[model samples]
Target: AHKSEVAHRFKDLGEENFKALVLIAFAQYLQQCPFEDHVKLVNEVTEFAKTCVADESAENCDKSLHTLFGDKLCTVATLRETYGEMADCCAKQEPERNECFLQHKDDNPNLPRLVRPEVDVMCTAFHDNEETFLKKYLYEIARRHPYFYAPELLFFAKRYKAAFTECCQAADKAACLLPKLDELRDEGKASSAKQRLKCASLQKFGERAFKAWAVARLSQRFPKAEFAEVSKLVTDLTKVHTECCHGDLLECADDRADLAKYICENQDSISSKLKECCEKPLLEKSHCIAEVENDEMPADLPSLAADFVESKDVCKNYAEAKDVFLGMFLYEYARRHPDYSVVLLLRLAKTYETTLEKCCAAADPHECYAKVFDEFKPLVEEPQNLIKQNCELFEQLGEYKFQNALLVRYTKKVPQVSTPTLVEVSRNLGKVGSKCCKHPEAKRMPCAEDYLSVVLNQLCVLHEKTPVSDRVTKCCTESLVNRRPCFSALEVDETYVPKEFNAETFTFHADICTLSEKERQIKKQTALVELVKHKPKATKEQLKAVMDDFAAFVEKCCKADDKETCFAEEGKKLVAASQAA
Candidate 1:
């Protein structure tokens, strides 16, 4: 983010704490410094390090910055005046120094945003000496976002590197790269929102509960991870958040780096896909690993496959080591039923806790606990399970993709149905998801139940006039409450075979490149939808590859000097290459 969350956090952290922040900031800055200046910079830290510790003035902090960049920072404008502000703080003695450097409002609030340099300026700066460019990049973000958490600054580094890497190769490099800075405002907003929600989760849930939640989440994320390694990360991350969530930005930043390093060091011990993430450098490594999709729960694992299942003295297990016990229970349950909703998972724990309490208080505790799990309804029952599954897809894929997914899936199921009707129903189903799924995960249970019924009723109405599948007719005739579930329970039709992949497609031309970005995305979406419809038997992975093939073909061909010829020739080759397998 170009702007930070608040004024300087050092005021609130106190003088003793600001040292850690400054030292860490220096370390980050040092990582990007020129090799020739490394000795002076390291000397700069040790000498001024004493100034920060026992000296009367923060002026040394200002002097050190002046030495580091040699009068360049001030000349570059007040944008690089973070060190100058530190000098102002250091001008005071120890305790007052805490509040001295604090900012009350956005600095130079009415000034225009940072302007873009021409492509030559940026690309040459990067290609000429990579670290010089990176050093400036880090300084700019640090000066602008002094209140940002360590991770946010790390993200800035990642995005800047990625943007340059992508744009440097573009036909029109500035066109490709300039908008990226504008886009960062949105990414910054979204990441900030995510950070807020996480902090809220920690505050709302106590330390123990947060630890359990973190364990469960990370375990599911790396379902194939060895429990011992997974639990280590859980404890470490929990410690990091609780200890450093407030003002310890340096420790937070440093620990997170160590966290990534630990994971990278042991990638093979976790999931195989982490190897890809580990191969990357710096903060990008963590972001890469985090973005890897959750692995599917291993086969043949049961819900009761945990040590807590044999808890004879349940109260003890639920009390002293409850975080461990609950975390184990949740991870086991979640991994075993990976498709289940978060609401259902939460209820699973809630039910277990209630059952434990009731049984613990009973005169014959064992008798009271005869059917602990049985007390809660199995979401796996008939139509409810499918409903849960659909909701998962609905949430994962936004409105448009969700609609096309249903469109493709239903088209295969009811080949007798017309395309227009299928499209209409698919759009209607998207409405169902949009309406119901709009509710927050905690409060939206009834909407899932209430709204699904209407769609089922409407399907039945359509079935009266036309055919869907035999299941649709039977499902529609059921009572409103039962209809949706019955429809959900229906099996996919096996009779529907796909058309041949002859020399035909919806579109394969350079004109596709001429469309607006929004229209181009729709074109890509339509291609994926049609591919699904064309080959219903293709695995999800293969279809994704097909989409990739389509995407790459368009991008490469669009940039060719003879674009029309490029498209005409490469389109056939892509189709052929696709058919080869």
Candidate 2:
């Protein structure tokens, strides 16, 4: 940063000559000198800048350098001869300029020189802290290594330099630095990689993807970037992660830190030789990395949850009818593994969902499941898996496991059925089960399924097409009047829905039916807002229009005698109408 400070002393010479003078100072003196020599050289450079102007006819800075520092400085004759040539070299190409200075220094052993560690320290400091690098160093990075650093990156760095400095000045240094540091790194990395690399195409691709990953990881760490920036960052990272990472080291979360370390260690390497393994087509990259010293990583073979469930099913319960059985299999797994967090369980659940999406998309899902069942059976039935699997799952879930477990239990108790109250009953039961099971004292309570199965079964049948919606509600009212405690507990309405669900929640209402006909209309309206937000190029105006359409629907169709059917029918048309308007 001090390099930039000293460099800026020459700003009066105009941008072109200011940069040229700074480059000469870096190439001839500062970069070549030891760390101890910086103070003296900075003082001399400042004096030379004050004495000299941009015009060639003006008193030459080279003569001023000689008068002030005599033989310690680069000679006026060499400077006069090479200054114009070096300026052009810096403008047109960094590689040519770097070569030119190297040759000049070689011919003159008296010229100051940077040791390897000195260069390393300089590069590391510049990347590690841009504000310090700029304020104290005078953007010496760009001056010393103009060719390696891209002009665009330098422009952005200078653009945000003040904001970054101000942020660092705030009382909360670390919080302000989080985003500024990342932003600084993004620009420096592009410049560092670009000027250093020989392969133009690969360098550009890597820089673009690298910048994307920088922004993406920043947003992941501190989620406050603009939505558009966040979306674009994710999209860019997705493309790179998709095409490059594939099933290799990048895809494995276990080895991510190692991969990151490796990348950082070799970032300034010419042509990204450290990442050469990723450049090869497909298996060759895998093979290359495997043959290398750092290829001992491990990963599990991927399989669906249905496969795990099928292996445990000695009764062959999943052999014929699979969807509901699969659902029950998930339910039973949650019951058996109360210690397992919902996230870990959800991992398996997502695998099951994926299996369903692929197989269920077929006209006959049973046939698809049957065909794939044999392939995954071995994975499901694997031996030597006991404490490790359970512990690993909990570790994967971290702090959220206990609450997630309740979610699993709750959802399991509430059987999947259509119609508001049945659906409502299921969700309400799940909520209650989640709450009850969350307590340390209730950890051993019999699974809700064991206790609530009778009422849930009755509600499931009542919710089916066998009875009308009114009849379903009536059944709950009559069953409660008959002194059936289970049925009474299962009775739910909008007002009775649990509201205190949260991280520390240990209670919920069993009688809350949040899925009444009116609730469904409100739920449908809320769902439309979410759907509209995700639409391609959706605007605030478009969202307002869609919501207006929903309000119109509620005002018209939702008041009908058969409100449920009427809303369901009109909700379909409403989405289209909103899109059209």
Name the top lDDT candidate: 1
lDDT against the true structure, per candidate, is 0.56, 0.37
Error of 1 at 340 (Å): 3.5
**Backbone collisions counted per model:** 2, 18
What's model 2's TM-score?
0.22
Q: How far does residue 193 in candidate 1 sit from its true spot (Å)?
A: 2.0
lDDT of 1 by residue, 1-581 (tens): 21111112323333433333443344333222333343344345445445454443454343333233323211222333433333443344544433332322121122334566788778878877775565555554444443335566556666777788777866787776767877886565435333433443454456765576566667667878877787899888877665444434544656676788888887667777777557776567867755566675577765472344455776676777765667667777767654444435655676787777666676776676656766556643533556567788888988767876766666556555545445555666777787766666533444464445434444454455556467666654533234544555555567766655654564477668787775675566556555655676766556656666667867876767677676577767767766764
| lDDT of model 2, residue 425 | 41
Instruction: Give RMSD (Å) of candidate 2 vs. truth.
Output: 28.2
Q: Can you list the residue pairs that collide in candidate 1?
A: 58-90, 58-91
Look at candidate 1 and tell me the lDDT of residue 546. 67
Give the best candidate by TM-score. 1
> In order, what is each prediction's RMSD in angstroms?
16.8, 28.2
